Amino acid sequence: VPSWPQILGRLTDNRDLARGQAAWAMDQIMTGNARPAQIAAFAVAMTMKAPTADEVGELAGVMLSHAHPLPADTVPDDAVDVVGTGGDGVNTVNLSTMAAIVVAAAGVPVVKHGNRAASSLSGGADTLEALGVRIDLGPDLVARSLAEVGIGFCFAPRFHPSYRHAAAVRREIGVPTVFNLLGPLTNPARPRAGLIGCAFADLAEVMAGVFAARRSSVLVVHGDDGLDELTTTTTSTIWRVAAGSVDKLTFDPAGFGFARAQLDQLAGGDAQANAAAVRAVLGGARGPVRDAVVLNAAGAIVAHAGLSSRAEWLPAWEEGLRRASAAIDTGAAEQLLARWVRFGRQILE
């Protein structure tokens, strides 16, 4: 007999839910049957109890069942995502977006999930728009983009219309909850690999567990400086997901020859400013922004390799970094962005 008092009562007692209860809650939420107060109570109670991977897996699985899918046979078997929770409160250039472009230019199909900024000045989606990339595409056109360009972008509001009740509650309460994990977990193209950033150190393990239950090849990452990206300012924590199991590691880019950068060297601005930062890096400019992009691109490439994993860790990273650097320095990344802008401009005719 599932109900709000039962489920909320269990969470406020600090108990894990019974199997199916989180799914019931998410069903209510996604059908418009949960009142805002119920949505908010659930989000908060789940957060303070401390969600489990099974619970979050139920939320994401129900959410995905309401999402628009891409057409059959349009997503390569080895597609990767590069995306994080956001919410790190540091306001950097768009590292996941830049890395995605480089990764795609290295020959790895990228189907990227994303959204506008929530607290930062310019999110991935905003910066893409400033670059001339069409972010508003439906399933058929993202699929075509992936085939013709090597990359596609699923704009979350376009693909998850039924999440609008939850999204509004998220904005009303302001505080991060378990719902902040759902974007990265609900890419509607379901790529099987990814580099997934998590701003909340205490939730990164749960997100890893959800990918492990899917048998995805993923690195869930949290910079030890608070970034929802692999950082160059210090070490990072990586939850490596492979063969359905999770493995926690401390990662140090110094071991690959990266100098320690400062956070302000990665600082972003508005969409225009961040668009110019993308153009600078793809044009081959050296410096801390390139270093961070290359590092994160390599991470995604390593996750992709893990789909066919012989893959010793250190060699995988070495080849990842080399591939990312070549993708920029051959001009391929700059050319890929231009091809992507061109594709969007062809849609009119």
Ligand X SMILES: O=P(O)(O)OC[C@H]1O[C@H](OP(=O)(O)OP(=O)(O)O)[C@H](O)[C@@H]1O
Ligand Y SMILES: Nc1cccc(F)c1C(=O)O
Binding-site sequence positions: 84, 87-88, 92, 94-97, 112-120, 124, 170, 228-229
Residue closer to Mg ion (CB basis): 96 or 180: 96
DSSP 332-346: HHHHHHHHHHHHHHH
Q: Which residues are annotated as a binding site for anthranilate?
A: 84, 115, 170
Q: Are 122 and 94 in contact (CB under 8 A)?
A: yes
Bridge-based pairing state of the strands 236-242 and 245-251? antiparallel
97 binds, among Mg ion, ligand X, ligand Y, none (CB under 5 to 8 A by kind): ligand X
- Please answer whether residues 62 and 158 qualify as being in contact, where contact means their C-beta atoms are separated by less than 8 angstroms: no
Q: Which of 100, 96, 118, 90 has the alpha carbon at shortest distance from 227?
A: 90
> Which of ligand Y, ligand X, Mg ion, none is residue 164 near (CB under 5 to 8 Å by kind)?
ligand Y
- Phi and psi angles of residue 248, each rounded to the nearest 5 degrees, phi first: -90, 135
Two structure tokens written together for 67: 């999402």
Spell out where the chain has E strands: 80-84, 110-114, 151-155, 193-197, 217-223, 236-242, 245-251
Task: Supply the minimum distance, in Å, between the C-beta of residue 91 and ligand X.
Answer: 7
CB of 112 to ligand Y, least distance (A): 9
C-alpha closest to that of 150 among 95, 108, 195: 108
Binding partner selected for residue 115 from a copy of itself, ligand Y, Mg ion, none, CB under the kind-specific 5 to 8 Å limit: ligand Y
Q: Answer yes or no whether residue 113 interacts with ligand Y by CB under 6 A.
A: yes
SS3 label, residue 8: helix
The rounded distance, in Å, linking the Cα atoms of 81 and 89 is 22
Hey, which residues does 288 pair with through a beta bridge?
none
Q: Does 96 bind Mg ion (CB under 5 A)?
A: yes
Residue 115 touching ligand Y (CB under 6 A):
yes
Per-residue interface string for the shown chain with a copy of itself, residues 44-83, x marking contact by CB under 8 A? xx-xxx----------------------------------
Decide if residue 55 touches Mg ion (CB under 5 A).
no
Partnered with residue 195 across adjacent β-strands are 82, 219
Which does residue 183 touch among a copy of itself, ligand Y, Mg ion, none (CB within 5 to 8 A, set by kind)? ligand Y
Q: What secondary structure does DSSP assign to 184-217, as a single string? A: HH--TT--SEEEEE-S-TTTHHHHHHHHHHTT-E
Q: Hunting for tokens 């830049």 — which residue is that?
A: 98
Q: Is 156 in the site for ligand Y (CB under 6 A)?
A: yes
**Among the listed residues 31, 32, 33, 37, the single contact to a copy of itself using CB under 8 A:** 37
Distance CA(110)–CA(79), nearest Å, equals 5
**Residue set of the binding site for Mg(2+):** 96, 228-229
# of chain residues touching ligand Y (CB under 6 A) = 16
- Given ligand X, Mg ion, ligand Y, none, residue 157, with its beta carbon under 5 to 8 Å by kind, binds ligand Y
Residue 112 binding result from ligand Y, a copy of itself, Mg ion, none, given CB thresholds of 5 to 8 Å by partner type: none
Assess 323 for contact with ligand Y (CB under 6 A). no
- The SS3 of residue 273 is helix
| Contacting residues for 150 by C-beta, under 8 A, at least 6 apart | 104, 105, 107, 109, 110, 336, 339
Per CB under 6 A, the segment of 79-87, 103-111, 255-263, 267-275 that binds ligand Y is 79-87
Options 61-69, 106-114, 172-180, 332-340: segment touching a copy of itself (CB under 8 A): 172-180
The correct pick among 147, 175, 243, 347 for binding a copy of itself (CB under 8 A) is 175
- Position 216, amino acid: S
Q: By CB under 8 A, name the binding residues for a copy of itself.
A: 3-5, 8-9, 12, 14, 35-41, 43-45, 47-49, 168-169, 172-177
Q: Which residues bind ligand Y (CB under 6 A)?
A: 83, 85-86, 113-115, 118, 156-157, 160-161, 163-164, 167, 183-184
